[PDB]
Amino acid sequence: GSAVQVINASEEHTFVLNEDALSEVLMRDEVKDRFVCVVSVAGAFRKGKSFLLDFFLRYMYSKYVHHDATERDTTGILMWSDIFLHDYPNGDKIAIILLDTQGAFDCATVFALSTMLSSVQIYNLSQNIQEDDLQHLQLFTEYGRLALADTGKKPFQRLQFLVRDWSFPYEAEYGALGGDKILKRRLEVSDKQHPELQSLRRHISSCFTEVACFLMPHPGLNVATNPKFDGRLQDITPEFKSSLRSLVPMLLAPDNLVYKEISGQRVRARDLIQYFQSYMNIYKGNELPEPKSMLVATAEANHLTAVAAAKELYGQLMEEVCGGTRPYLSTAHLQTEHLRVKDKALFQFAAKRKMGGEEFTEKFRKQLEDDLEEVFTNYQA
Numbered sequence: 001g002s003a004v005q006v007i008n009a010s011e012e013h014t015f016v017l018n019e020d021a022l023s024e025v026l027m028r029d030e031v032k033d034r035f036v037c038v039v040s041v042a043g044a045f046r047k048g049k050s051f052l053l054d055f056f057l058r059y060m061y062s063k064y065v066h067h068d069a070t071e072r073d074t075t076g077i078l079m080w081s082d083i084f085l086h087d088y089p090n091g092d093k094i095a096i097i098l099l100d101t102q103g104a105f106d107c108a109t110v111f112a113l114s115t116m117l118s119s120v121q122i123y124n125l126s127q128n129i130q131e132d133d134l135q136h137l138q139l140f141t142e143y144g145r146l147a148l149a150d151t152g153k154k155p156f157q158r159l160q161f162l163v164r165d166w167s168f169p170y171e172a173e174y175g176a177l178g179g180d181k182i183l184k185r186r187l188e189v190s191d192k193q194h195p196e197l198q199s200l201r202r203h204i205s206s207c208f209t210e211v212a213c214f215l216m217p218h219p220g221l222n223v224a225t226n227p228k229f230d231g232r233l234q235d236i237t238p239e240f241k242s243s244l245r246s247l248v249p250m251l252l253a254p255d256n257l258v259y260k261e262i263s264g265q266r267v268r269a270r271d272l273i274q275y276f277q278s279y280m281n282i283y284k285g286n287e288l289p290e291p292k293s294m295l296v297a298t299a300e301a302n303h304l305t306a307v308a309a310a311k312e313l314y315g316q317l318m319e320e321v322c323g324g325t326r327p328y329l330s331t332a333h334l335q336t337e338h339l340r341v342k343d344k345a346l347f348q349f350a351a352k353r354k355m356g357g358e359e360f361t362e363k364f365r366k367q368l369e370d371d372l373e374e375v376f377t378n379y380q381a
């Protein structure tokens with residue numbers, strides 16, 4: 001059809017990455033600018049995830065495109081082949097990504113990826129915001145708390161508690177007005193004497209730019225209880241549809257378009273392909289052990305990305321000004337000219353600022369020099 005959803009990982013029995021696959025799309029000339037949205041939905045299998053998404057399209061394909069008319073046996077996460085570009089004026093230039101968790105679910109421990117990798121997380125919850133649901137949000141409030149000391153800047157931007165089939169609008173009215181009555185409660189109250197480490201209601205704010213909750217009307221017994229739905233639009237309750245119209249926009253079009261911001265700085269799309277394979281290593285270990293750091297893995301991709309960011313620059317400053325149509329023959333101070341570009345590759349490397357440590361970071365520029373300086377010791381003399 002018009003577009004497909006590409007797998008990124010599998011599971012049974014290992015936990016492969018489809019490196020090419022992810023790469024075979026992000027690298028399209030949406031190589032940029034600003035990965036960003038990066039909107040994801042996750043949570044309870046068949047609490048209607050891959051459906052809220054399916055309206056994210058049949059209602060986005062038409063504010064970015066035609067402005068009027070017109071995981072079967074594997075987990076991992078989805079990406080739609082289509083991607084939604086923008087913008088100007090003071091932008092950006094922004095690609096738009098949709099991920100839809102799925103597959104081996106029986107929240108099935110692949111909500112961290114789909115959150116580590118996301119500028120807008122939609123925790124797709126049912127009935128109520130329970131405590132168990134609140135307990136899956138631990139391994140970030142610590143991971144980030146470190147980072148809070150470390151980077152100094154809150155990782156994670158927006159988490160959207162989405163309550164599907166909320167059923168007492170008389171206490172709290174459907175939508176954002178009541179999303180933030182219910183939420184505010186359940187992060188007061190049982191912060192008072194009741195649970196132990198889930199008392200991370202105290203740390204949450206710090207680790208997210210925006211945390212907000214939304215309450216959905218039950219759609220209807222006919223959608224809820226039917227195998228392979230289509231019917232018609234009437235077949236859905238008006239209360240649902242009226243909510244979408246407040247929902248989907250609320251999230252989409254800028255500035256509800258949320259900038260993916262590692263360290264404290266936006267990121268292009270060509271760098272996701274890094275962050276994707278980086279985390280994914282220390283997930284089920286790549287060997288055995290987890291988690292909390294995490295901060296090892298984020299920094300180590302926070303960093304190796306600037307290397308490849310300031311190595312592309314090297315060539316694309318050297319073999320043009322210092323080579324190519326006037327090639328590889330002595331001057332004898334192309335060296336002097338190469339020092340310049342090497343310097344540029346370091347003087348303009350320290351873009352300010354990534355993160356990871358001190359002896360941990362500069363470890364890399366040690367290997368920029370020794371990987372930059374390996375053209376001075378070249379090529380065929």
Ligand SMILES: Nc1nc2c(ncn2[C@@H]2O[C@H](COP(=O)(O)OP(=O)(O)O)[C@@H](O)[C@H]2O)c(=O)[nH]1
Nearest residue numbers: 045046047048049050051164165219223224226
């Ligand atoms: N109760 C309820 N059911 C829904 C809602 N939205 C979709 N469904 C039903 O959920 C099923 C599909 O869920 P789906 O998104 O594919 O599974 P998931 O991706 O794993 O969450 C179908 O029966 C839909 O009728 C909702 O808001 N409430």
Ligand SMILES: [Mg+2]
Nearest residue numbers: 049050101102
């Ligand atoms: Mg699904």
